[PDB]
Amino acid sequence: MFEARLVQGSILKKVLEALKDLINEACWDISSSGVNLQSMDSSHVSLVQLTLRSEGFDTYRCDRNLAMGVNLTSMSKILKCAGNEDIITLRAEDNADTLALVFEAPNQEKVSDYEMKLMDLDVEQLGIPEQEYSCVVKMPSGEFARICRDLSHIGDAVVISCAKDGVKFSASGELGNGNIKLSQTEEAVTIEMNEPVQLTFALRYLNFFTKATPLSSTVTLIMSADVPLVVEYKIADMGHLKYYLAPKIEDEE
Template sequence: MFEARLVRSSILSKVTNAIKELLNEATWVCTDSGIQLQAIDTSHVSLVSLNLLAEGFDEYKCDRNLVMGINISVMSKILKCATDDDVVTIKAQDNADTITFIFEFRSQQKNSKYIMKLMNLDPEYLNISDINHNCLIRMPSNEFSLICRDLSQFGDSINIACIKDGVKFSTGGDIGTANIKFAKMSSVDNKERAVEVEVQEPIKITFSCRYLNLFTKATAFSPRVSLFMSLNMPMVVEYSIEDVGNIRYFLAPKIEEENDS
């Protein structure tokens, strides 16, 4: 039997909000150490990796490994039936074809139960445990969200250039160009606002604005975001999920087409 309880249902609601525009459905693998999800988006451009640790839950029990095919959109709708300060308990029997969500409304003597049918999905396992990188950027997550939003007004792609003394985000299109620069360790007087850049080798890589904007749906999880980059390798965008775990997005770089002139 699987049973997990969180006194803050908003955490699970934020999880579904952070992935529902990338994934229609996904396999949730429950073990005694926690819940893991790995899934490639519908366009096969990015990958989502979610890790929720057992010790991050207020109560957690998993007698045997359980694989559950979840419709993300339906799960999101169910979680919207709770308010942020409600308690949520998730239950599923071994080999069950349904999963149960129970909400306890602390503001009144009330609880509600929703039963969702599971899907038959094949789990996706990829060897993504190690993050090798030539450049690491740590910055405020809301700042990264603003960069992605603002630059997407000028172009479909964002160029990220890491050099020894900082990082530059830039783009260009028919209406003009835009670029935003950060010096290494700017705003060091405030750790939460600092932009930290670690560069082993200077690189410049181009990524899709659309997908980066979708990744920033996870901004609500953490005040900081980490970007791991290497030449000709997918970028990893990582957010911690309070004390529960983390979510990572993997995005392949865009290959610039050469002009045949």
């Protein structure tokens, strides 16, 4: 029997909003340490990893490890039925056909109970990338979302350049080009540059990642020459939601 009670149910609400536009189906890995989810988007240039530690929950019981195949569009629909202050309890039997979600209103005349059907998913084992930390940018999550939104008007790809304690985002298209330069100062921008890095990413996928913005005031960019970019959002006390993105490749000279 798996049962987990989360007092701030909005966390779960926001997590599904941040996943659903990116991936349809995913396998939720449940165990004694908590909830873990890993999946790629359909064209496999992008990976998502979610961690919710058992201690972040107000109640946590996991008798046996589960892998729940979940239609995320379905689960998103159910979670839109929970209010922002609701207490949410997940519950599942030992070889799970269905996942139960219970929503309790903050003052208690109202209780909702949903039964979500689980699906069958092919799981292909994914290497989570080795992390090199060549440059690390911590900044406000809104500002990062706004940068990505802005440069989408200019072009479809952003060049991220990290150099001696400044970072620059660049784009170009038929109307012209632009760039946004951030310098070092919950309003703080911090740039930590161990080796300079310059890479090109698809704005389409960065704009999906920023659907996670409501989970945190700050976002961390981890960029390295040799690895996918990491975009990370800390979730409360519980864990994180991390997005990995391969650099766009390049033309040949």
